[PDB]
Amino acid sequence: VIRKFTKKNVARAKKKYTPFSKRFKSIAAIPDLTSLPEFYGNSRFENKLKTTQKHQIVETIFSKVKKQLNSSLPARENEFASIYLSAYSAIESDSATTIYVAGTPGVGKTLTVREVVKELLSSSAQREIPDFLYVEINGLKMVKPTDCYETLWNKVSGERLTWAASMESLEFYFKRVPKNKKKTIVVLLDELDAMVTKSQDIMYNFFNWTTYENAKLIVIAVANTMDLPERQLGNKITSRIGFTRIMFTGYTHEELKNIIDLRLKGLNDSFFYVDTKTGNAILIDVRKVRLRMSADAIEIASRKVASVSGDARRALKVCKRAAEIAEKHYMAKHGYGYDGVQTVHITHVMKALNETLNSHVITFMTRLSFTAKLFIYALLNLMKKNGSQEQELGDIVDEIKLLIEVNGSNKFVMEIAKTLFQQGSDNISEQLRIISWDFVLNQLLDAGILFKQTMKNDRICCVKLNISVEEAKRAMNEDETLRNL
Amino acid sequence: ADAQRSHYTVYPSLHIPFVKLLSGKESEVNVEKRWELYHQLHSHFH
């Protein structure tokens, strides 16, 4: 038969369509799912990425410092206690509950929740509480937002079903199955804002299963914002999530110090056998070298990060960047390759902090050609003349022509007018646009300095500055020629 | 009420449309013969 179109790349998973409510003949016929081989969880790729080294690589003194500062809990004790007490009471009373946690990035939400469920699993290993199943659902790690329905049911039953069948199965399992035939499930919903669809059915279902009497379900919902339910969710879901919500504040600088010095307990103020032939250092031709990080360097890093964000990732990356700068300076002076006392002091931390804060924008427009800077200068002149923050391109063409023909006594303009309008030939006729007109316009568009409107008339098309006018004039004043006229 | 519906089907409960002329004093066979004359002329036209 003749097809109107073809779908030759369809890849369909092997997932059944029959839900759990039809799996048994009656409610009384459902067995103990805890005593089932495939229920409640009762790494095939990790050998793929291995090879032989055939080399002994050099690990300098700063390498152990840089590995100790990677993201891969002295300051989270009240939040740990609250989350642990709520989850513990819900587990050992066979209750269903929702624990809401919100915060800015890198303040330790995921780490605290994972340590809470680790200590809960340790409690259930010694029979202080009934045994439970732990499930992680990250909303940013799903292809489709409905795949969470597929994931949780697969973690509960071992079945592979499609998403509507999975959510029917989960609805039947939480609602109708008796408690004595079930197990407690703790579900971490990480990145909750990613699980928000147009119709909020996933959020309603996940928080409404926690209001079922038989469910034995605990949902730990981790969100960006305290008032995410009030901003983006319905009143029923906001009622079901609750009024009691746990805020993870940004870290103060004493806590960022505590985190960094907890990362630097075993190598800060310690000795190394350095082997100055290669620089490969071994922790206790060969010298005993003390390594230290300055406490005031950690102080200024922690103070800057705690004022700006309180992010632990940012503080660890700042200290790691400082160690990288010190290691680059160290390997420059010896030529150690990769195959006394060395200190990560204040200035490395300051150079690491300022390299994220210095702007390349003014440096970028400084090193442009004459024609691009002439474009920017004419656009600034038109912006101050007619007061508009949006200028027609034909006006910019006429302004460039006017600035060339008015400042015709300038020596640079005398030297460059023939280049700008004839490419210095006297065989090319006089042009209506300058040489490299479309080039510098497209260059300022790729850089994001300019915005242009989608019109096909070139003269009446408008152009806007996407950067600050003060930055543009500061760039234009650095040039010797354009600051004169 | 089906008058508030968009569409509905009806199956109602349960021989020529020509009526008796001459102030109601036409013969019944004149009516039938008029019906057949119209039918033959209309068929001969179409």
Next chain:
Amino acid sequence: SIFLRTKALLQKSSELVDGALPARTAEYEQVMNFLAKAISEHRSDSLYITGPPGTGKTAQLDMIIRQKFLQNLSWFELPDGRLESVAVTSINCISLGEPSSIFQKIFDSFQDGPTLQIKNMQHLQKFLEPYTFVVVLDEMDRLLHANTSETQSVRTILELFLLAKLPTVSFVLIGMANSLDMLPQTIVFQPYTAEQMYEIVIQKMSSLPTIIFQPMAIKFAAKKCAGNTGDLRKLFDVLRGSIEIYELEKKIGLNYIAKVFSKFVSTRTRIAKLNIQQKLILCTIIQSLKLNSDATIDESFDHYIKAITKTDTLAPLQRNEFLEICTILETCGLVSIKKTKCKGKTKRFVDKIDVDLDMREFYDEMTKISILKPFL
């Protein structure tokens, strides 16, 4: 313990422990005046229940189905005592693919047998014509069709509520919905009052050996939770959090209820923690949203560099530094930053500043400092 048992009974998933909720004894009779009327005479009528969230609508209707009641055939004991026939189902409408399948969802509850294709009101009507049938529809708001104009959005609900009144068919349709999230007889579940919440709380706590709360604490919690949103879930959460704060910090009392409301709920203190350099940035930003009123960072920063050159107070700083102080005002709670397409001839995405801090307390904190008064 008893803290554990009180905490378990104060959850939203708690067990419902002759057939009316403890503060709902009016509305239950109203539903009885819908049931014992239309079950006996076999009429076709439609009920519609409204209310704010957590007013007991699902709980009361589930108690009615549990205690006072083809697959779902039951006996209804009449006030006359005839014990007449009724098939009752209860469908939450959110766990449904499309709204237009609800008629099919009505069939799969009331079917042993043959499986027919029902895609309209007509098929379900002609299936229910040769026979009564009671369908409780929770979350009626899910039947609305989005993005399909005002008339055609209510398409399925008009079909359901029209077939719910049609002659010689036997259909009672009870539809509960929530008012904040959105002819049949309308019954409203009003939000609970503090005396009703006290009644509910002592009746739920009656199964325990003792009540661990002081009663002024329970009445204070009930009064602080009631109002225009009398949501019982909020009161359960407040009392559960009071037990939790007691357990962490160690009868309950009033101070723990007040500490719940202190922990789980201000622009004077935010300004007072800032550096004079940071305080000038906040003054310029609210001044920047006076002239433009939809301005970017680079338009707010352009205004800030204007204010400095006519005043010469503090050294003028760079744009990136301006943004991190603006990011400093993110993490203390004054400046808010979003991203949307700008309104103009060019439509591409820009970052903007919005400010909602109380303006009454902003002018009080800044007029005390003399050098900042040019920047208001």
